[PDB]
Amino acid sequence: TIKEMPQPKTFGELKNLPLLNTDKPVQALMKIADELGEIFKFEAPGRVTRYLSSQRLIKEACDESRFDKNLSQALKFVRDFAGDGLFTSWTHEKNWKKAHNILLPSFSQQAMKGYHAMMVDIAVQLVQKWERLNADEHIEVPEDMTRLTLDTIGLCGFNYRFNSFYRDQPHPFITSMVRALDEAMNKLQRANPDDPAYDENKRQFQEDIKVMNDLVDKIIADRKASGEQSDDLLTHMLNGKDPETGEPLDDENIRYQIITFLIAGHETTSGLLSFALYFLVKNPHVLQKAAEEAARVLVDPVPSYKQVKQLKYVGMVLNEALRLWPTSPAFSLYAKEDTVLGGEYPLEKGDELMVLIPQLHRDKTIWGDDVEEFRPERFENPSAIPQHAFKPFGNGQRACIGQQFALHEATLVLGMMLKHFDFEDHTNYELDIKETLTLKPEGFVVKAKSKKIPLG
């Protein structure tokens, strides 16, 4: 019984594109979803996709025998500097499976034991920065979380120190990377890209790509020359061999993986830490519960890997922040073969689907009617959550390879913040979600009063 699907307002030849001509497209899509339901068609010039919001349909979309990851236009633009790294490659590209096989072990929960010391190094820098603020000062949350995540990924990724806490202006690589990502995201909403008015953007874009490649290529070359072995991903990549073929990743691909870790993990993880602190200061009883656990568990001057694993409630707080505002809000899929979705929507080979994660996470048939409330206790027993109901890290073999790294980092840092400071929402901050490739609470600021507990 084929059902025709909904579609928002069209604009002649422009189709639906004008509707995303806003600074907050995902939040706009969420409203369209509220209006049209679990599935709606969305067209742009020369493009068509279908946005899914219900767990019932998304669970079918997550069947890998039927759908595979699609490279959205955003990922195609990011590929200009992320290359055939894991995030911007097709599943069928030789280098995707090769890098996946080599890197998977280096990203397991067990492997986090090896990155822990480096994560603690940067976390201690963040805590010390806040301990050193004077009384009249405050904290710019996303800004400091981003300094932390970029530096942590640089240190664990290739033993390089961006030293973000020593600067007002970021290290040149960071400025170039951030500018390159911004340019890639800006191309999504510029009709006449060839307009000479964009010749300066193109020149700057090529310059930024060169800054990124030059630094990373240099570090790879310096490492191969010295023969030094470290606890970073670069050592794993220089020494790894794909079990299927016996081939190692070549230097160019290693460079793209390094750039990819920074691109894929810096903003998503800092956004998660920022949203989590936002929900905590807005819900004092929850912050109190989380602070009590941190004080009980983190009994040493420096957290150990095992202690971070015991911060169960902090982990629930992070999952609930990811439920409400998953920081990489949507992912794209294509139909591998002709198929019918949900018994009513026929699809043809190659047809695209978009999983709208914030909406999936607000499916009342799964979570209950109080979906807008921040309640970490929803994650008390993970086994009760239906398959494919909670997907902040994507799906299947193309799910986030950095999930254990991101959660270890976030749990460690949030635990240390809760152990060391009391927090004040001194401006009664009004949530304003800024959208780029990711989501974050723009302008979120707080004041942190030290509990004066030694940090080893």
Ligand code: HEM
């Ligand atoms: C809470 C923070 C994070 C979130 C929410 C997140 C989310 C995601 C999502 C949704 C995908 C799937 C994208 C798609 O289907 O197109 C993904 C892929 C990926 N993420 Fe993350 N991520 C986070 C942190 C990280 C970190 C810290 C790293 C690096 C240490 C990382 C590395 C990657 C890579 C390499 C892929 C592509 C994997 C593959 O396709 O083989 N992510 N991530």
